[model samples]
Target chain A: DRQLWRQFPQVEPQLTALQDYLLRTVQLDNQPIHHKILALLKSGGKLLRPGYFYLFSTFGNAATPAQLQAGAAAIEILHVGTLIHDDVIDDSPTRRGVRTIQMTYGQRNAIYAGDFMFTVYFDQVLKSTTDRSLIQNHIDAMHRILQGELHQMDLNYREDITLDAYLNEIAGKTAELFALSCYQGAQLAGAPQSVIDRTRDIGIAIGCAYQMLDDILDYAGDPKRTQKPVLEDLRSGVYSLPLLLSLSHAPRDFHKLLKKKQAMTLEDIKHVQALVAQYDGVGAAKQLAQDYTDRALTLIQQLPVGSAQQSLEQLTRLLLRR
Target chain B: LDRQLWRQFPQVEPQLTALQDYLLRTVQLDNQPIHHKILALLKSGGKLLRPGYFYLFSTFGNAATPAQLQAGAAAIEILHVGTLIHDDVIDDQMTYGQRNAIYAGDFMFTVYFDQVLKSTTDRSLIQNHIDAMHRILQGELHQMDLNYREDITLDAYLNEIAGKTAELFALSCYQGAQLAGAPQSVIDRTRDIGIAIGCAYQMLDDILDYAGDPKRTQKPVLEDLRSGVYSLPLLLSLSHAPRDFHKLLKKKQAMTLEDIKHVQALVAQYDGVGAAKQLAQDYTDRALTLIQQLPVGSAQQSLEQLTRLLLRR
Candidate 1:
């Protein structure tokens, strides 16, 4: 984890700058400015995907300090930008255990924050590359992300979401950013075409693993250990990997119990947990995470021996742990 | 500078001037599927200085190709044309000579930029234009954000315009020269002059906010003062006026006749116009020096003329 963060010391500063820049750029009306900006900036995440960018840059001839810094910076801006917009869509009051920008600043400012970050992302791309195609790649990725969100919304509240469908959705919504981070960093450095392809694939796989972990953690983790409620995926009808596995032979009694508003009742919760255990869903998820971790490791091995390579290996290992 | 030479070329002036109409008409962006003028007052617009620079600058190099010159000229016009749309939206002036101007401005901008980006065969130069455009929007938002605050410092205020207006102005000149195959050093030099001139131009706009003919402005003269905007003319008065005169500079909740007179008198007394004119001249002089560095040719000479046109005295 130390190595993971050490590889991206620039990310924190960029995040801070991105946040500060956002505060300056979001010309909001009737909003609490500093409080919301401070809140969103402090709401931290693993920054695992960012580490992948630095790692992947090592495998390519194109990686420069400027390119890495800019790629890292652009990713965070786009990440936070998407989060702000997501909170608005989810009507989420809190994210990462803090008040979301939308909750603090309102929906309008949230929109502006998203837009401002987008411009900043594009700005970083412009600073790094005069390649119009590369710039358009960033633009195209954002469009795909939003388009994916719109598609998800169009099919919202459909409890019978297929696992294939879920994967497809997250690929666009979540993995697309990871893909962008890898491809963009490579593109900036003028990495070999092969390295770009490999990095992009690694990103997509890691995105799958990361999202899968989130899903399993939401449903099966100790309630006291997680900010989210027990069986939250099942309760929310989110159709996470574990829940989807459980649904293949979902118990009628459990299904009947879940139909009630208090689905995570003491008895029902125990029953669902027991049912999840029966299916080896958690074990399967753990295995899947390991598979992705190994695949990413294989990619890293192909890359040159560098600090970023070690950090990338460390990040994938860290993701699978616990 | 090119401005003096441009003025002498009355023959070429009309063609450049006609670019204003072409841009205004072409940028009638139809936000909806069906196209109609959303910004109705767009037809009655002001001069197209960018087009003149574009037309004159194209004469310098390979952009002398008719198609290339038109592309370069039209791109500048379209960007300006689009900006007016967003600017009008932010400024919230609904009436331009007794018609709703917002939609037309917005539409024109949308049409102009999109057409240029897609239609231009050589897309790299236009990509720079688009990048500059992205910065322009960010600056606009930055300025609006500052406006949302109750207390804004003079330094912050100027920085805001530097982003909103000056960045694009600089980019327009740089890209124009780049398209014409101006050397990188020359392009960089022109960019600085463009920025200085753009900042000075915006400063003059602020000065005009308080001192302009209200009949022509449609909005009352010194209305920005009433709206709590402290332009340079007003800012200069704050330092120069006597202790008792501070009351006259107090931002208005509502513009009283007495308040207007006080501001107008204070500005007139401080020779705000003379100060602004001198500052603008200083910037224009800097711009001219940069232009003079260009290889001696009609294109360089025309830039000199354009600088003269921008100078106040």
Candidate 2:
């Protein structure tokens, strides 16, 4: 889907080293801790956060060559740790069709997988960054992520969710990582606080927009086949943008339709979906997502213009279309 | 509640409050985090009931400092949190107050145990505490695999509860005793008392579930019964409820409202509460009598008051 290797030619060599290093991290003989960590690291996918951090790091300074690689490696490691833990809570069955640690190895092993990966990430953060603030910021980010999860639980099973609230909630749950990813990279590159802060805001906006699109795409159905647990949210009475909107203006039939397992019946699902389609709920959601993308675009304009900037813009455009 | 015991343990409040913060921080999980959902479920009210009981029990020994008892209380609370979190997984709770995902509890339990170890400079003693906790979780997970059946015999039932609930109670008592400089025999004896009392406490809790006000329970009445957890009070009441009632226990199905009511009514009629209270009092009596053997002091008086408060009130 991308001439990704060509776009960032330096990445290919670094990725090779990174993958090898990651593999060895898992294969350390008789090393249970490292092995547990490596399983999660080997389970990596597209290193999006690392890319952001790397680019931001490079843009701010005539960075030592290692800074880009270090930022990339740290973000990827942190992401793996975050994903391993997330998959367990989401009770997701597969990651890119591979059995997730939780699904393949049971919840206990999956937990250790998260822990091991997280430990590696923390160690790397402390080691790679000379800045105490950066290290502490990374730690603080982990703490916020955990706390955000607890807050999500407090509102679990609630039916009358509002769009503003859900969007704000997503900012914490998903966008916070995106923000941290960007700011962390920029900070490492010796970007000024303003640059780092702006980059973080851009990441937050893009993350929220991308997530809303992801949710809508999941509900609209997906060819990716990795749909977020879509109908569960509806069936479980977790009212979202379209559903919440439909609930307000929905006909009596739609009201009854959204109520239970009955909501999942083919005709009932189509009925509610049809209402979403009719009221332009999808259009409204997409438009709101675009507004956030526009915010990201504004940040791109402020950033140092170069290939990195172009790639970010391209990603923004792809996000807007979704 | 006793001023004398309160004076003896003024330091506990500060340490316990710190533990509360540790607990609050430990349970949070970001939504995208795999265990986020589970952590969410775990926030369903700490209730602090058992931890309160543990703190009050410290009144039995003046030698136990507030810091020592606070650590002990924190450890016990963490242990209970571990058990309850794991229990949710086995029970297939879709959400706790609102979250799902089984590992939420695991994260909480992990962070909790970590905090417990770090809370003190006593490395060897902390290891002892952690070992007891590890044993408690192993016992829970082991029994969970084998004991879902409705007719797990009374003896097996007792053993299961002992492994799950009693072990932690006993550990808490013994560890607290160690902190207080109680003799080994006294610690052993108090440990036994704590275990017995925990069993009795669980039995009364089951009775409350069966016959008490449904409004008080945040979830639902007969949730255990619906989920096939035939608890102690029900087990005892079944032995006494007419033979027809046995059929309901034997045949598991979605119990009608009336049927559930009938079981509750029968249990009440058979006076499960009285039996439950009497059993609780028996354990309390034994616990207090054991405490009496401790040298007479304000701690001893506080222990007696706690037993009375626990059993009578």
Candidate 3:
């Protein structure tokens, strides 16, 4: 996780301080929960949300180090909390990591552990920022996450889901947390209101592009590098952007397989993969993701000259290019 | 008051109806698949135990308003079901929501916090609830540590149940009294009553597993034993013939039907239920003794009557 930040040499050291801070701050008096929670925090993930926030915090010299730590800690807690909750919600046998806490302590304990982290987030958030309107944004973000999950849940398995609805849920599910994390850092660091607000908007745009590539990777990327098996989402009745896009060209012909959902066997998935290739779902979604990435780059360019934008652009490109 | 349990809350049963009604009206959900399943949970108030205590204690105040009582009642009920909903998900428990149960619990929490924050409620009140919540989770995690143990202590077991049941029950009493403008003395006394009540209630709940009462318990009897909640019946019975039950617990693999049958057979032999029944009687008698001393009123009669009736179950 640390080596991913070598390109952003200036922001690398800040990552360690934030990682150390969560361990120091969130421990409970009890042994099992505290020990297990400590293990989870120490266990690895990209920490991309907090990573981006750290870079954004560099925009102004007035940044209170303690507040920066608090803000970053809050964002990371939100990330870990949601990650564990998502693991619980997405109880797919093949569903993968970041919920290693779930496997370690059992699902019931993980729910309690994740609930503790959420309560921890509210406390950390209070310490991190004093802006009332901004405080409300943090809350509204959590509400949207649940609503977005429901929104996605509503549209899931539909033969009629559109790119517009898909994109809206995407922003709520993935993008807003990115924005929530960054804007707190942006404002907390005393970045210009212009710079601060745009950092948020830029995160929203990039975050959408980020998830788009993930859907793209599900169909088109190398399984070895991706490490996740292709077509897992499709099997679970979640029609990602590429598959949803491709269906427009082939829905009438594709009715049989798309309706099969979990009933689709290996050969059927391969056939659907061939159909996506023939119909160019991967290519179209790829173009759309690139457009979002490009638009996000323009938003970053609009920011006034600062050392922060350099790492922002660098970290931003590294992510989407995946 | 259809259930025997609801009849126990004679003076307050109407409020229990209102409590369930308020939840249906209050737990607003958008037009999504989530609405129906979540509404089913709202409707399944399960005899209104926590909130029933909440409403009962609230009556001690000189002027208890309906909205505040209703708000506090819904908070405890909704918070509890969220935990239960997750419990369903945790154990592969089924049907009203096995697929989306986790979300219902989580979404309910969003609703729980929303109602708490939107209210004219105090911040310390909210903080105490969060603290209460941590203790609940802490108790559950501690149970995992004690699971399948041959030598689980009564004190350790009581501590877990205290956090799991007593703390929340005490908070229900505290929040009930605190929210409805009771004096601090009323608040203090009701909390003590709540702990005794919770301890007895949980004891009764656990004993039913080994009680061999065919009419009671919806789930498979002793399912919790398989998972490692060494509840009162087994824990108390362990005191008499230590090595007898010790061998049964030595094998921690999931208990089969016959294994449980052997457990029940052994429990009967040890008179575990007899010891458990006595402990339960002691707590309720203590609770009844305390309520009789409280400022006597219509509420006091309801309280003693409920605790006295609760013991017979």
> Scoring each candidate complex against the real one, what DockQ results?
0.05, 0.05, 0.26
| True-vs-predicted CA distance for residue B122, candidate 3, Å | 3.3
- For candidate 1, give the lDDT of residue B151: 47
Decide which is better by TM-score, 1 or 3: 3
RMSD of each: 10.0, 10.9, 4.2
DockQ rank order: 3, 1, 2
Q: Candidate 1 iRMS, in Å?
A: 8.7
TM-score of chain B of 1: 0.75
Candidate 1 C-alpha lDDT tens digits along B108-220: 43344444443344556655765666666656556436532334566776677777678766765776667777667666676686777687778777666656552233264
Q: What DockQ number belongs to candidate 1?
A: 0.05
Q: State which candidate, 2 or 3, has the greater DockQ.
A: 3
Per-residue alpha-carbon lDDT of model 1 for A188-306, expressed as tens digits? 76667767667777778777777777767655655333334454444544545765676667656546656663345556656666666678777776777678667766875776566
Off by over 4 Å in 1: A1-45, A55-70, A81-136, A146-172, A184-202, A205-322, B1-55, B63-160, B183-189, B211-228, B240-313
Top-TM-score candidate index:
3
TM for chain B in all models?
A: 0.75, 0.72, 0.87
True contacts kept of each: 0.03, 0.01, 0.20
User: What C-alpha lDDT values do all the predictions have?
Assistant: 0.59, 0.59, 0.74
